[PDB]
Amino acid sequence: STGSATTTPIDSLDDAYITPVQIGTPAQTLNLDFDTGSSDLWVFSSETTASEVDGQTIYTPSKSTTAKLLSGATWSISYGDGSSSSGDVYTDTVSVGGLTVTGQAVESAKKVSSSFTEDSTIDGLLGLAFSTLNTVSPTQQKTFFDNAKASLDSPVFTADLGYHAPGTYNFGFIDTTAYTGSITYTAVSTKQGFWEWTSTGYAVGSGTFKSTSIDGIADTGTTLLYLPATVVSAYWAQVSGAKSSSSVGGYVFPCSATLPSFTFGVGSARIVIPGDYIDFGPISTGSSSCFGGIQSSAGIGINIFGDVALKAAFVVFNGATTPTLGFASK
Numbered sequence: 001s002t003g004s005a006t007t008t009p010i011d012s013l014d015d016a017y018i019t020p021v022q023i024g025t026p027a028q029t030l031n032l033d034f035d036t037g038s039s040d041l042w043v044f045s046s047e048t049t050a051s052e053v054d055g056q057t058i059y060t061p062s063k064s065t066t067a068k069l070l071s072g073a074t075w076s077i078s079y080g081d082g083s084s085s086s087g088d089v090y091t092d093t094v095s096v097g098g099l100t101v102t103g104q105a106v107e108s109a110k111k112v113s114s115s116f117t118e119d120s121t122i123d124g125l126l127g128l129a130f131s132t133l134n135t136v137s138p139t140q141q142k143t144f145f146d147n148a149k150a151s152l153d154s155p156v157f158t159a160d161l162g163y164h165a166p167g168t169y170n171f172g173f174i175d176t177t178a179y180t181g182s183i184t185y186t187a188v189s190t191k192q193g194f195w196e197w198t199s200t201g202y203a204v205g206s207g208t209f210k211s212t213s214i215d216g217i218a219d220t221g222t223t224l225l226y227l228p229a230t231v232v233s234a235y236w237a238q239v240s241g242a243k244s245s246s247s248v249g250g251y252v253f254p255c256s257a258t259l260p261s262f263t264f265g266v267g268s269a270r271i272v273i274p275g276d277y278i279d280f281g282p283i284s285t286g287s288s289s290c291f292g293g294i295q296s297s298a299g300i301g302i303n304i305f306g307d308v309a310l311k312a313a314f315v316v317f318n319g320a321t322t323p324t325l326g327f328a329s330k
């Protein structure tokens, strides 16, 4: 089997991407944030505290003939940005882009943090990191990908995120029309439950490439590119007037600037992030200070190749017995 679904930016800045997902019978379509940095499929629901719902579509298990309470199971997750949600668990039929899993754990939110209530465009998350991070207790649950894997034509999914445009998530096959050149594969460590890999270095604009190992994770559910402070300082030093602002919470730059590109290494290959991808626009409406898309990881404990980086590539998440990542230009 295979599946293929379009993923669409939630706003003009590409802060996140939403993908329609069918849950239940008859289908209830929710727009979920596919997150390769977490392992819970959770949704706004008929159980979510009413004051915490503001425009999201909800899953109502009582309307699904295939929904079963997963008796006694609860979940609770906290994300690197301070956000959280928690609740109870149903099993139900979940389909993505024509690929169906029966008995998927669908984590129904009772509580969500402010950051979720205030995003009417995101009806929940679909985690695609390793199932070892799943937060369901007392019986940990599998991701949609792990449940689908055995049925797929190839144990892979691919992320093809657009810059200010829709893109695609495919499951079970590699669309050889979707990229240019060849795919470079690189080793993955699953020790922290992430798609963790080691970049071979970086360049800023037309500068020389610096060969240096940068461990990090491929994370579709993080907007920006978070890298070591040394790397990030070297980038923003090439932008007149850029500075780190503790008041704003990262590097800002004059909105009048033209940003340089940023290249990262994948083995002997190179992925180039155009400068425009690193512009996240005014810090507040009408400001002439703009927020940067490359930020320091210093206050995180991990480097994160988020959407700024991933949208510059066709990315293969190879879930074979020995997992690997692949990157191609596009």
Ligand SMILES: Cc1cc(CNCCS(C)(=O)=O)ccc1Br
Binding pocket: 016, 033, 035, 037, 038, 079, 080, 081, 082, 083, 115, 116, 119, 122, 221, 222, 304
């Ligand atoms: C939309 C959304 C997604 C996620 C999942 N990714 C979080 C990545 S980080 C580096 O910020 O911890 C959290 C919160 C919101 Br709000």
